[PDB]
Design a binder for this molecule. Structure first.
Ligand SMILES: Cc1cc2nc3c(=O)[nH]c(=O)nc-3n(C[C@H](O)[C@H](O)[C@H](O)COP(=O)(O)OP(=O)(O)OC[C@H]3O[C@@H](n4cnc5c(N)ncnc54)[C@H](O)[C@@H]3O)c2cc1C
Length: 499
């Protein structure tokens, strides 16, 4: 423990942008990450386990592996009991919602599908009217794409390869309903993916890896922003260090209590770390819990009532259609999506749907979709002092508008093609729409509500939030490009005016 000029909590998108720019500005910066640095070959010689061979590396402190959502019917057979371990993917269970987040250096960039998508400017303008959309679209979004290593699939290869048959089938089906598809830019190197298919390089996307990490191809933040931040000479990263409490010191600045653990979860030390500038990049869940805890235990008593509010799951809904026998989706499906259905017009019927691959590795005729919808419902994180946890006050009926929007779009597709939903992919009960999970948690510390328009926490100086907690519950697309671009805007301004 001791003093560092700047501390960044977490190592996801908001954190990584912040630390790079701080380091470039000459500010010595310590990043504290509760998960691991994923660079140690494991028992199979790989850093990460695949989706057909999950082991303790797959899961943050659970005692059994779980099938990727949509896949239980085919992948429960590979599940096994495991030791609780500092694995890469954390299913965080709240009363009526399960939020999936990455744990490690790089955060959700380790486990996500790589999809780098800019929101519709008119929707950005609706959700954040206090922000200048011009600089976002002409400066920050381009900067983020370049630093993230966003790239584009070759359309000829896409059209030919067996690995994207699943995507072409849904494109054809959607077309019969008058719905168009879009190619989705990615941080997975598509050139690498071609060479995987050709047998020239080790497979990752083409070997059923994504949600527990990619051993190859995916340019997660440890390779992009965080590598650059380390390269400044002004940034260091301490792992298996979880920030528990934040206080304003009597002499200025912030002090943190930080627990260091081993990979089995044993407590090794509790350290006090202080700083001048404190940046929260612990995610929608993590940053919001730190601040509700600090307000409600009296260590940051001047936090406002908007801390904790305004959470939403980005309208996330999963659903699946049963194809006709003559439309097999293939046994070989790249684990990186390449196409979406863009039916998003900012109205309440809007849907942006990823055409999602399935990992079963045999023909199932199923088409899987992750829908992103416009649902005004929000939840609130409240502090439970008894257990020292933020609890998310969301109820499953709050996803009814999301279900309704997703169903209306997929009903069109089913009507045009004479197909039906699958009802058995998410559990025993007939359920065509998974409505109590989230991959894209947004809000809790909303920009302009809990913070100023650059993420400065209201009530405090030199205290910043940088991450998905800033976004008001919805962006209409996969969120990380927006988190990244918004973090570029925010840290630039903070450094210029405050540092
Ligand atoms: C299965 C899945 C698929 C997804 N697919 C996509 C996709 O293709 N495209 C897209 O745009 N988005 C996708 N997402 C969402 C995207 O990954 C997240 O929106 C993004 O990672 C959020 O960034 P963040 O900076 O807010 O936080 P995170 O990336 O979640 O990072 C927070 C970091 O802080 C650490 N941390 C938390 N609390 C503490 C603490 N108290 N002390 C220390 N460290 C702490 C965490 O361990 C983590 O490393 C996906 C996510 C999942 C789970």
């Amino acid at each position: 423990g001791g003093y560092v000029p700047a501390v960044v909590i977490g190592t996801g998108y908001g954190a990584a942008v912040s630390a790079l720019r701080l380091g470039e500005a000459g500010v010595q910066t310590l990043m504290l990450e509760m998960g691991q640095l994923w660079n140690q070959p494991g028992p199979d010689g790989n850093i990460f386990c695949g989706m057909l061979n999950p082991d303790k590396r797959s899961s943050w402190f659970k005692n059994r592996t779980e099938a990727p959502l949509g896949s239980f019917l085919w992948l429960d057979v590979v599940n096994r009991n495991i030791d609780p371990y500092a694995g890469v993917l954390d299913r965080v269970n709240y009363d009526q919602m399960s939020v999936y987040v990455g744990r490690g250096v790089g955060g959700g960039s380790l486990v996500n599908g790589g999809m780098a998508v800019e929101p519709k400017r008119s929707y950005f303008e609706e959700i954040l009217p206090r922000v200048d959309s011009s600089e976002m679209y002409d400066r920050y979004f381009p900067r983020a794409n370049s630093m993230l290593r966003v790239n584009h699939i070759d359309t000829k290869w896409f059209e030919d390869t067996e690995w994207y048959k699943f995507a072409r089938v849904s494109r054809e089906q959607a077309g019969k309903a008058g719905l168009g598809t879009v190619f989705v830019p990615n941080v997975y190197d598509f050139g690498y993916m071609q060479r995987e298919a050709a047998g020239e390089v080790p497979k990752s996307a083409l070997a059923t890896e994504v949600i527990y990490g990619n051993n190859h191809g995916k340019q997660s933040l440890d390779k992009t922003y965080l590598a650059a931040a380390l390269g400044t000479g002004k940034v260091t990263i301490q792992t298996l260090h979880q920030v528990k409490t934040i206080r304003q010191t009597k002499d200025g600045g912030y002090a943190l209590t930080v627990e260091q653990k081993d990979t089995d979860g044993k407590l090794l030390a509790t350290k006090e770390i202080s700083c001048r500038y404190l940046f929260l990049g612990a995610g929608s869940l993590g940053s919001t819990e730190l601040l509700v805890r600090a307000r409600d235990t009296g260590t940051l008593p001047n936090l406002n009532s908007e801390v904790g509010a305004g959470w939403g799951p980005n309208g996330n809904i999963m659903t699946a259609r049963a194809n006709h026998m003559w439309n097999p989706t293939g046994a070989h499906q790249s684990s990186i999506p390449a196409l979406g259905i863009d039916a998003w017009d900012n109205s309440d019927s809007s849907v942006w749907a990823e055409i999602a691959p399935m990992p079963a590795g045999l023909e199932t005729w199923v088409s899987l979709y992750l829908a992103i919808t416009k649902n005004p419902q929000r939840g609130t994180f409240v502090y439970d002092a008894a257990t020292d946890r933020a609890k998310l006050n969301w109820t499953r009926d709050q996803n009814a508008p999301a279900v309704n929007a997703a169903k209306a779009l997929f009903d069109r597709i089913n009507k045009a093609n004479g197909t039906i939903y699958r009802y058995d992919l998410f559990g025993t009960q007939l359920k065509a729409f998974a409505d109590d999970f989230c991959y894209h948690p947004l809000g809790g510390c909303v920009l302009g509500k809990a913070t100023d328009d650059y993420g400065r926490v209201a009530g405090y100086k030199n205290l910043y939030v940088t991450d998905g907690s800033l976004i008001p519950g919805s962006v209409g697309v996969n969120p990380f490009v927006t988190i990244t671009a918004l973090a570029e805007r925010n840290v630039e301004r903070i450094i210029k005016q405050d540092v």
